[PDB]
């Protein structure tokens, strides 16, 4: 069974009563107004909890279920408010007990309906500079930096590149005041990555799950045989799962052509083998088909492969 269901709020709100013939209003609009609170002469909603950004590295994600859909607060004292019968905003008659003891995992959960979405941890500029110095100056391998700071290796390399770009931009005075204010207000919104904590440091033993293993296979053997990861790897015809981590932690003859004055291009001839080189004859044409191959040029132009 299914009907159209206007997405009314799941929490109580005061609905319209008798309306002046010319109001022309909807209950959804009133629900939004109550959620937002009064709008300033400046076009601002100071009374709404979520109007302003946090500043203490504790994200201010929505909690419509814990707080019963009461999103209003005093902007200066931050104390909860409620809409009284007379159309004013005052203290709640009773205090909420679900808004003080909030599980620390819930504070990093952007969406109330998805427990598996959590925000990442921002790295402090000091840690990023430390990693950049370690990788570039002291020449420490990315594996041991990853282990020391508990960061996945691609993230470490990305940090190195991003810090290099930042260094260039700072040497050129391209980081304007607006950019610095934006960066620092964004940085104070998210939790800060802590190298020392065990539960805040990234797991460093992850490997992709290939299709080959995903199928469950079972072996019946004598009751006392040992059967370890290496035997399992042999059975599935794969490298053992430890060499996968080990390998993830880490000729053709060519002839360049004679250029002469006035010639606008050079020829390089790469050696190939007959029966493997060429455009095949009677190959599948997909240009009129839904999976036609689209690629991008070295200049970023969309081309048809």
């Amino acid at each position: 069974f299914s009907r159209r269901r206007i997405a009314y709020p799941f929490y109580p709100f005061k609905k319209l009563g008798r309306q002046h013939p010319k109001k022309h209003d909807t209950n959804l609009k009133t629900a939004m107004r109550q959620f937002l609170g009064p709008k300033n002469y400046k076009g601002e909603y100071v009374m709404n909890k979520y109007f302003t950004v946090p500043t203490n590295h504790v994200p201010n994600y929505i909690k419509p279920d814990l707080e019963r859909g009461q999103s209003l607060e005093h902007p200066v004292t931050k104390k909860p408010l409620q809409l009284r019968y007379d159309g004013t905003l005052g203290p709640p008659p009773v205090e909420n007990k679900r808004l003080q003891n909030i599980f620390k995992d819930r504070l990093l959960q952007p969406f109330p309906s998805n427990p598996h979405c959590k925000t990442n941890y921002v790295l402090s500029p000091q840690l990023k500079q430390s990693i950049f110095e370690e990788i570039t100056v002291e020449g420490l391998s990315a594996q041991q930096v990853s282990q020391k700071y508990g960061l996945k290796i691609p993230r470490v390399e990305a940090i190195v590149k991003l810090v290099s770009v930042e260094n260039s931009w700072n040497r050129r005075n391209r980081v304007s005041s607006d950019l610095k204010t934006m960066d620092e207000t964004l940085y104070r919104m998210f939790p800060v990555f802590d190298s020392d904590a065990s539960f805040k440091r990234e797991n460093l033993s992850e490997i992709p799950v290939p299709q080959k293993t995903l199928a469950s296979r079972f072996l019946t053997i004598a009751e006392s045989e040992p059967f370890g990861p290496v035997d399992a790897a042999h059975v599935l015809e794969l490298e053992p799962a430890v060499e996968t981590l080990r390998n993830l932690s880490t000729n053709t003859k060519v002839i360049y052509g004679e250029l002469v004055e006035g010639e606008r291009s050079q020829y390089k001839f790469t050696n190939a083998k007959v029966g493997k080189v060429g455009y095949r004859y009677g190959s599948g044409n997909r240009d009129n088909k839904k999976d036609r191959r689209i690629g991008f040029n070295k200049l970023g132009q969309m081309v048809y492969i």
Binding site: E44, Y45, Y50, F51, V53, P54, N60, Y61, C117, T119
Partner: peptide, 12 residues
């Protein structure tokens, strides 16, 4: 910052 920025501020 733009208003109502914090509900959607998620670090990927």
């Amino acid at each position: 910052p733009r208003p109502f920025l914090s509900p959607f501020a998620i670090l990927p």
